[PDB]
Amino acid sequence: SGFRKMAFPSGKVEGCMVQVTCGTTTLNGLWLDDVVYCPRHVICTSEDMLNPNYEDLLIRKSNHNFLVQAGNVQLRVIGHSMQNCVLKLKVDTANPKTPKYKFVRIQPGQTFSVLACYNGSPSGVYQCAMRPNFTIKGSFLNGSCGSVGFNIDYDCVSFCYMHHMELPTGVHAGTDLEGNFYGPFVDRQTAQAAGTDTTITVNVLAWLYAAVINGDRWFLNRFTTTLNDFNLVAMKYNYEPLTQDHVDILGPLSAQTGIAVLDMCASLKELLQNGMNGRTILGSALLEDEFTPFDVVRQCSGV
Amino acid sequence: SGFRKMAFPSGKVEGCMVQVTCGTTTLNGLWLDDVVYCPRHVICTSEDMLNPNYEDLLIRKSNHNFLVQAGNVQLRVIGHSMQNCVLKLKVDTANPKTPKYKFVRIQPGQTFSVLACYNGSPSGVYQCAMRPNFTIKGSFLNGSCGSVGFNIDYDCVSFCYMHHMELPTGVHAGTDLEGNFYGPFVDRQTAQAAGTDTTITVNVLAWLYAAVINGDRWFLNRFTTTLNDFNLVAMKYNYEPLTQDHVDILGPLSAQTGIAVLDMCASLKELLQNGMNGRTILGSALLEDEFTPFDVVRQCSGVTFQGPHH
Numbered sequence: 001s002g003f004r005k006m007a008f009p010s011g012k013v014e015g016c017m018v019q020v021t022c023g024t025t026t027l028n029g030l031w032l033d034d035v036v037y038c039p040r041h042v043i044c045t046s047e048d049m050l051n052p053n054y055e056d057l058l059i060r061k062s063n064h065n066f067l068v069q070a071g072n073v074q075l076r077v078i079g080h081s082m083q084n085c086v087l088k089l090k091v092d093t094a095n096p097k098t099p100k101y102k103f104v105r106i107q108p109g110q111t112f113s114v115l116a117c118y119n120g121s122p123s124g125v126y127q128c129a130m131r132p133n134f135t136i137k138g139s140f141l142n143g144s145c146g147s148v149g150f151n152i153d154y155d156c157v158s159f160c161y162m163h164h165m166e167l168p169t170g171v172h173a174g175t176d177l178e179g180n181f182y183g184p185f186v187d188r189q190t191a192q193a194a195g196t197d198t199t200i201t202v203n204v205l206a207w208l209y210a211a212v213i214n215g216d217r218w219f220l221n222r223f224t225t226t227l228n229d230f231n232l233v234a235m236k237y238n239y240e241p242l243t244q245d246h247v248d249i250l251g252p253l254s255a256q257t258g259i260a261v262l263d264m265c266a267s268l269k270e271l272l273q274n275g276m277n278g279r280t281i282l283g284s285a286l287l288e289d290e291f292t293p294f295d296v297v298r299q300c301s302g303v
Numbered sequence: 304s305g306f307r308k309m310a311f312p313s314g315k316v317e318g319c320m321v322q323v324t325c326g327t328t329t330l331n332g333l334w335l336d337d338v339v340y341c342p343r344h345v346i347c348t349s350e351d352m353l354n355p356n357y358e359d360l361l362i363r364k365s366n367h368n369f370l371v372q373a374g375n376v377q378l379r380v381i382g383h384s385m386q387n388c389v390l391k392l393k394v395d396t397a398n399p400k401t402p403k404y405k406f407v408r409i410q411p412g413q414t415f416s417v418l419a420c421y422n423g424s425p426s427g428v429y430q431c432a433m434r435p436n437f438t439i440k441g442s443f444l445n446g447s448c449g450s451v452g453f454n455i456d457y458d459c460v461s462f463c464y465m466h467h468m469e470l471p472t473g474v475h476a477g478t479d480l481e482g483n484f485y486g487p488f489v490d491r492q493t494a495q496a497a498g499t500d501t502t503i504t505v506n507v508l509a510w511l512y513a514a515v516i517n518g519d520r521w522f523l524n525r526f527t528t529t530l531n532d533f534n535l536v537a538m539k540y541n542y543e544p545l546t547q548d549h550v551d552i553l554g555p556l557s558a559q560t561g562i563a564v565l566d567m568c569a570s571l572k573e574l575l576q577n578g579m580n581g582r583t584i585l586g587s588a589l590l591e592d593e594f595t596p597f598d599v600v601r602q603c604s605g606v607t608f609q610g611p612h613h
């Protein structure tokens with residue numbers, strides 16, 4: 001029992017983190033086989049980031065301009081190419097600690113673990129979710145660029161995020177491991193607007209189900225609601241629309257607890273209108289939306 | 304910027320987790336050098352946990368009754384001894400992945416990362432704190448016993464907790480790596496009450512300091528209070544007393560922010576009585592108390608630890 005923001009073990013990812021330096025700019029790289037992936041803005045200074053032209057800044061660079069350090073063994077760069085917003089540096093040595101891995105692009109609402117790194121050294125691991133506006137509310141300091149987000153599906157490490165930027169409002173943007181940003185963001189220091197951030201409804205319900213599995217039941221009620229009847233209320237409170245797909249996804253949690261999805265939907269709606277009245281659910285005074293239904297299954301059952 | 308429940312990188316500890324099976328009971332063990340540490344109740348069945356005598360159940364076992372599996376090597380047990388509530392099994396092979404380690408007993412209020420394990424395979428890592436009532440608010444399922452809690456200095460893993468049981472209120476109890484339980488709990492299926500839990504005051508102040516580092520300053524005021532005057536108000540709200548020691552520990556955060564500890568205490572006093580008035584601090588509507596002053600300093604300063612590339 002008990003419920004925690006649980007991250008995956010970071011060992012398999014620790015063995016892939018390297019330091020990539022270009023000029024006076026240093027950030028982290030992902031070393032899989034004989035390729036090192038890192039944000040392409042490693043070739044920029046601070047003044048450069050105001051309006052960088054990556055076409056030009058890369059043509060001016062050679063293999064010897066990239067200093068890659070794995071621990072403090074220096075990896076020799078033998079090639080370089082740009083794929084969207086990530087730089088791919090081929091080195092002369094394959095990473096002996098490369099795990100079974102896969103490059104995936106996640107949907108908003110899905111969660112993943114982040115291994116925060118500085119100078120290629122691990123600092124901490126934590127869980128977060130891809131917001132509906134394609135930002136993430138992470139913890140990143142200067143030098144953290146190139147840190148990766150990942151899930152471990154059984155034995156395969158699914159890399160899904162590479163950190164690139166901190167926007168002026170404090171949230172963070174990045175790409176998949178093919179270099180395509182999540183959301184409308186670009187690797188330039190400029191005014192960039194995110195979409196309205198909304199709450200991940202299906203995650204709140206999954207988390208409400210985790211609460212009931214853990215003995216928190218005070219928010220259950222006797223009303224019942226439907227699909228259209230739930231969504232008309234949800235979006236006044238900036239909640240994502242709940243689909244029949246979601247209702248199926250919550251099925252296993254419904255069965256484990258014996259409370260139908262539409263019963264639970266009536267409860268949340270109630271919490272939306274009246275508030276929590278000084279009470280708590282799973283140690284929180286807010287409705288948590290960064291646990292997927294799968295996440296609840298791992299902690300309360302086991303995938 | 305940003306602030307998160309950050310756990311230590313778990314790589315160095317992942318290489319030490321093994322599966323320990325005795326009879327029909329399977330739980331996790333910690334394999335350091337040629338010794339495997341695990342909870343001693345691996346030798347009990349459900350019928351034995353009602354009122355076990357571990358001296359007896361252990362005398363009726365010998366080395367071949369303990370099956371230890373590391374990955375897909377079967378470790379051969381060549382000795383077994385009991386130290387308080389942990390069982391120590393010597394194996395014929397030293398763990399090649401042993402790091403600097405240390406067995407420490409932590410104080411209530413201190414935090415550590417837990418590597419949740421099942422069948423000797425790590426499943427997840429999360430941060431938590433030793434509650435003042437010597438429980439921990441963990442996340443553990445059946446088979447998780449033997450999971451360990453730890454801190455990392457730089458390359459040294461300080462082991463401080465081994466999981467043993469879930470209390471009926473859903474919280475968890477365990478021992479240090481010498482087998483001594485934290486708190487008044489015992490490894491027998493019996494009536495056990497944890498007791499009233501209090502809020503870790505010095506941790507809340509550390510987290511308030513983290514907030515101001517991150518740009519959240521709305522709770523600051525012009526007042527200062529005295530340790531005695533703050534504690535009179537705090538302890539009416541089920542808060543741990545704040546000592547001169549605590550005030551010292553917060554010194555570095557005070558210097559970094561330019562806010563005296565007793566100034567921050569004046570802010571906390573207000574938040575305790577009036578609430579947050581529909582606002583949030585670091586994305587939370589509650590006062591967080593599971594970040595130590597040290598936890599705030601490294602996360603806000605980006606302290607790193609030794610990776611696997613020597």
Ligand SMILES: O=C1O[C@H]([C@@H](O)CO)C(O)=C1O
Nearest residue numbers: 140141142143144145165166
């Ligand atoms: O999160 C951030 O990303 C950039 C980069 O400098 C970090 O490597 C920055 O300034 C942050 O605060």
Ligand SMILES: O=C1O[C@H]([C@@H](O)CO)C(O)=C1O
Nearest residue numbers: 001443444445446448468469
């Ligand atoms: O923490 C726990 O201890 C018991 C034990 O049966 C697991 O081995 C249990 O089910 C937990 O959740």
